[PDB]
N, CA, C and O of each residue as an XYZ file, in Angstrom:
372
protein
N      93.051    138.884    117.933
C      92.488    138.946    116.596
C      92.927    137.782    115.729
O      92.507    136.645    115.945
N      93.774    138.066    114.745
C      94.264    137.036    113.838
C      95.766    136.827    114.014
O      96.574    137.605    113.505
N      96.129    135.772    114.738
C      97.532    135.462    114.985
C      97.720    133.972    115.258
O      96.754    133.250    115.502
N      98.970    133.522    115.213
C      99.261    132.122    115.456
C     100.750    131.840    115.506
O     101.512    132.348    114.683
N     101.167    131.029    116.473
C     102.575    130.687    116.630
C     102.936    129.472    115.780
O     102.431    128.373    116.006
N     103.814    129.682    114.803
C     104.241    128.607    113.915
C     104.403    127.299    114.686
O     104.718    127.304    115.876
N     104.186    126.183    113.996
C     104.313    124.884    114.630
C     104.286    123.745    113.630
O     105.177    123.628    112.789
N     103.262    122.905    113.719
C     103.124    121.770    112.814
C     103.083    122.233    111.362
O     102.586    123.319    111.062
N     103.608    121.404    110.465
C     103.634    121.730    109.044
C     103.109    120.567    108.209
O     102.760    119.515    108.744
N     103.058    120.764    106.897
C     102.578    119.732    105.984
C     103.322    119.791    104.655
O     104.014    120.767    104.364
N     103.176    118.743    103.853
C     103.833    118.677    102.552
C     102.816    118.794    101.422
O     101.749    118.182    101.469
N     103.156    119.583    100.408
C     102.272    119.782     99.266
C     102.614    118.812     98.138
O     103.769    118.710     97.724
N     101.602    118.104     97.648
C     101.793    117.145     96.567
C     101.134    117.627     95.280
O      99.927    117.864     95.243
N     101.935    117.768     94.229
C     101.410    118.220     92.952
C     101.496    117.153     91.880
O     102.170    116.138     92.057
N     100.812    117.382     90.763
C     100.813    116.429     89.659
C     100.024    115.175     90.020
O     100.436    114.059     89.703
N      98.889    115.367     90.683
C      98.040    114.253     91.087
C      96.850    114.103     90.145
O      95.968    114.962     90.105
N      96.831    113.009     89.391
C      95.750    112.749     88.448
C      94.391    112.888     89.127
O      94.262    112.666     90.331
N      93.373    113.260     88.339
C      92.007    113.438     88.842
C      91.354    112.115     89.226
O      90.205    112.085     89.667
N      92.094    111.024     89.055
C      91.587    109.697     89.386
C      92.183    109.195     90.697
O      91.709    108.212     91.267
N      93.224    109.874     91.168
C      93.885    109.496     92.411
C      92.958    109.693     93.607
O      92.282    110.716     93.718
N      92.934    108.707     94.498
C      92.091    108.771     95.685
C      92.923    108.655     96.957
O      94.071    108.211     96.919
N      92.337    109.057     98.081
C      93.025    108.995     99.365
C      93.559    107.592     99.634
O      94.639    107.428    100.202
N      92.796    106.585     99.223
C      93.193    105.195     99.421
C      94.524    104.907     98.733
O      95.392    104.240     99.295
N      94.675    105.414     97.514
C      95.900    105.212     96.748
C      97.072    105.941     97.396
O      98.188    105.423     97.443
N      96.810    107.145     97.894
C      97.844    107.948     98.538
C      98.390    107.242     99.774
O      99.603    107.152     99.963
N      97.487    106.745    100.613
C      97.878    106.047    101.832
C      98.584    104.734    101.502
O      99.544    104.352    102.171
N      98.102    104.052    100.469
C      98.686    102.783    100.052
C     100.082    102.989     99.472
O     100.975    102.166     99.673
N     100.260    104.093     98.753
C     101.547    104.408     98.143
C     102.596    104.707     99.208
O     103.703    104.171     99.169
N     102.239    105.566    100.158
C     103.151    105.937    101.235
C     103.513    104.722    102.082
O     104.681    104.507    102.408
N     102.503    103.931    102.436
C     102.736    102.748    103.243
C     103.525    101.686    102.502
O     104.379    101.018    103.084
N     103.238    101.530    101.214
C     103.928    100.541    100.393
C     105.428    100.817    100.357
O     106.234     99.893    100.246
N     105.794    102.091    100.450
C     107.196    102.488    100.425
C     107.780    102.512    101.835
O     108.808    103.143    102.080
N     107.117    101.820    102.756
C     107.568    101.761    104.140
C     107.596    103.152    104.764
O     108.434    103.441    105.618
N     106.675    104.006    104.333
C     106.593    105.368    104.851
C     105.182    105.681    105.337
O     104.402    106.323    104.635
N     104.860    105.218    106.555
C     103.545    105.439    107.162
C     103.322    106.896    107.552
O     104.275    107.628    107.822
N     102.061    107.310    107.579
C     101.714    108.681    107.938
C     101.264    108.768    109.391
O     100.189    108.286    109.747
N     102.094    109.386    110.226
C     101.780    109.539    111.641
C     101.012    110.832    111.896
O     101.129    111.432    112.964
N     100.228    111.254    110.909
C      99.453    112.473    111.046
C      98.136    112.410    110.298
O      97.400    111.428    110.404
N      97.836    113.459    109.540
C      96.598    113.520    108.775
C      96.886    113.649    107.282
O      97.937    114.154    106.885
N      95.947    113.192    106.461
C      96.100    113.256    105.012
C      94.959    114.041    104.374
O      93.801    113.903    104.770
N      95.294    114.864    103.387
C      94.296    115.671    102.692
C      94.411    115.496    101.181
O      95.508    115.540    100.624
N      93.272    115.297    100.526
C      93.244    115.118     99.079
C      92.436    116.224     98.409
O      91.227    116.333     98.612
N      93.113    117.042     97.609
C      92.460    118.139     96.905
C      92.398    117.864     95.406
O      93.173    117.065     94.880
N      91.472    118.529     94.725
C      91.309    118.355     93.286
C      92.514    118.905     92.531
O      92.558    120.087     92.190
N      93.489    118.039     92.274
C      94.683    118.456     91.561
C      95.929    118.376     92.420
O      97.047    118.392     91.907
N      95.737    118.290     93.732
C      96.854    118.211     94.665
C      96.425    117.555     95.975
O      95.258    117.206     96.152
N      97.378    117.393     96.887
C      97.100    116.782     98.182
C      98.138    117.199     99.218
O      99.262    117.565     98.872
N      97.753    117.140    100.489
C      98.651    117.511    101.577
C      98.812    116.361    102.567
O      97.874    115.601    102.808
N     100.007    116.243    103.136
C     100.293    115.186    104.100
C     101.102    115.721    105.276
O     101.995    116.549    105.101
N     100.781    115.241    106.474
C     101.479    115.669    107.681
C     102.661    114.752    107.979
O     102.495    113.543    108.138
N     103.852    115.336    108.052
C     105.063    114.572    108.327
C     105.396    114.597    109.815
O     105.183    115.603    110.492
N     105.925    113.472    110.321
C     106.299    113.339    111.733
C     107.514    114.188    112.093
O     107.499    114.920    113.082
N     108.563    114.085    111.284
C     109.785    114.844    111.516
C     110.363    115.360    110.202
O     109.958    114.926    109.124
N     111.310    116.287    110.300
C     111.942    116.863    109.119
C     112.710    115.800    108.340
O     112.667    115.768    107.111
N     113.411    114.933    109.065
C     114.191    113.870    108.442
C     113.289    112.922    107.659
O     113.645    112.470    106.571
N     112.121    112.625    108.220
C     111.168    111.731    107.575
C     110.648    112.337    106.276
O     110.516    111.643    105.267
N     110.354    113.633    106.308
C     109.850    114.332    105.131
C     110.888    114.345    104.015
O     110.587    114.001    102.872
N     112.110    114.744    104.353
C     113.191    114.802    103.378
C     113.437    113.434    102.749
O     113.594    113.319    101.533
N     113.470    112.402    103.585
C     113.697    111.041    103.110
C     112.493    110.534    102.321
O     112.647    109.885    101.286
N     111.298    110.834    102.816
C     110.069    110.411    102.157
C     109.938    111.047    100.778
O     109.595    110.375     99.805
N     110.212    112.344    100.702
C     110.125    113.071     99.441
C     111.102    112.508     98.414
O     110.734    112.258     97.266
N     112.347    112.312     98.836
C     113.378    111.778     97.952
C     113.023    110.366     97.495
O     113.314    109.979     96.363
N     112.393    109.603     98.383
C     112.000    108.235     98.072
C     110.707    108.203     97.267
O     110.450    107.252     96.528
N     109.897    109.246     97.414
C     108.630    109.337     96.698
C     108.756    110.249     95.481
O     108.750    109.783     94.342
N     108.869    111.549     95.732
C     108.995    112.526     94.657
C     110.162    112.175     93.738
O     111.304    112.062     94.185
N     109.865    112.004     92.453
C     110.898    111.668     91.491
C     111.260    110.196     91.520
O     112.083    109.736     90.728
N     110.644    109.455     92.435
C     110.905    108.027     92.564
C     109.600    107.239     92.627
O     109.598    106.051     92.950
N     108.495    107.908     92.317
C     107.184    107.270     92.337
C     106.275    107.849     91.256
O     106.155    109.066     91.120
N     105.638    106.967     90.493
C     104.740    107.391     89.425
C     103.324    106.871     89.666
O     103.128    105.695     89.970
N     102.345    107.758     89.528
C     100.948    107.392     89.732
C     100.114    107.725     88.499
O     100.113    108.862     88.027
N      99.405    106.725     87.982
C      98.564    106.913     86.806
C      99.403    107.318     85.596
O      98.923    108.016     84.703
N     100.657    106.873     85.577
C     101.540    107.200     84.474
C     102.138    108.588     84.600
O     102.854    109.046     83.709
N     101.842    109.258     85.709
C     102.354    110.602     85.950
C     103.214    110.638     87.209
O     102.812    110.142     88.261
N     104.399    111.228     87.091
C     105.316    111.330     88.221
C     104.768    112.269     89.289
O     104.411    113.411     88.999
N     104.704    111.781     90.524
C     104.202    112.579     91.636
C     105.299    113.478     92.199
O     106.442    113.050     92.360
N     104.943    114.724     92.496
C     105.898    115.681     93.040
C     105.552    116.035     94.485
O     104.412    116.382     94.792
N     106.544    115.943     95.364
C     106.346    116.254     96.775
C     107.322    117.327     97.244
O     108.526    117.231     97.002
N     106.796    118.346     97.913
C     107.622    119.437     98.418
C     106.957    120.113     99.613
O     105.736    120.066     99.764
N     107.769    120.741    100.457
C     107.261    121.424    101.640
C     106.170    122.423    101.266
O     106.392    123.326    100.460
N     104.992    122.252    101.859
C     103.864    123.136    101.586
C     104.122    124.533    102.144
O     103.722    124.847    103.266
N     104.791    125.365    101.354
C     105.102    126.728    101.766
C     104.438    127.746    100.845
O     104.319    127.521     99.641
N     104.009    128.865    101.420
C     103.354    129.916    100.653
C     104.105    131.237    100.791
O     104.573    131.802     99.803
N     104.214    131.722    102.023
C     104.909    132.976    102.293
C     104.603    134.011    101.216
O     105.499    134.713    100.746
N     103.335    134.100    100.830
C     102.910    135.050     99.809
C     101.859    136.009    100.361
O     100.722    135.614    100.622
N     102.246    137.268    100.537
C     101.337    138.283    101.057
C     101.757    139.676    100.600
O     102.913    140.068    100.756
N     100.809    140.418    100.035
C     101.082    141.768     99.554
C     101.411    142.700    100.716
O     100.757    142.662    101.758
N     102.428    143.536    100.526
C     102.847    144.475    101.559
C     102.599    145.915    101.117
O     103.051    146.334    100.051
N     101.879    146.666    101.946
C     101.567    148.057    101.639
C     102.129    148.987    102.710
O     101.412    149.408    103.618
N     103.417    149.301    102.595
C     104.054    150.179    103.558
C     105.496    149.795    103.829
O     105.828    148.611    103.897
N     106.362    150.806    103.985
C     107.789    150.593    104.250
C     108.040    150.030    105.645
O     107.103    149.669    106.356
N     109.311    149.960    106.027
C     109.687    149.437    107.338
C     110.840    150.240    107.931
O     111.643    150.821    107.201
N     110.915    150.265    109.259
C     111.968    150.998    109.952
C     112.901    150.042    110.688
O     112.674    148.833    110.710
N     113.949    150.595    111.289
C     114.903    149.779    112.019
C     115.402    148.603    111.204
O     116.217    147.818    111.688
């Protein structure tokens, strides 16, 4: 039915001006000597990026998030996590 074994992950980017384009995102990451060895996604208000390794993401975020400004607005990068789901019922054991 509906199942999946955790695996590849991505990073969520917030505070992205409505003028920001995929070209700028790729140019920004590459300009900081941080190439994307995966896929890039640009959403209206945010964007997602695939990181090669955990170390790369942590280093990239620290070098980007809080250290990079786009369109006069500071870009925020963090692990794209949700873990949000309503639960209807107790648990045993």
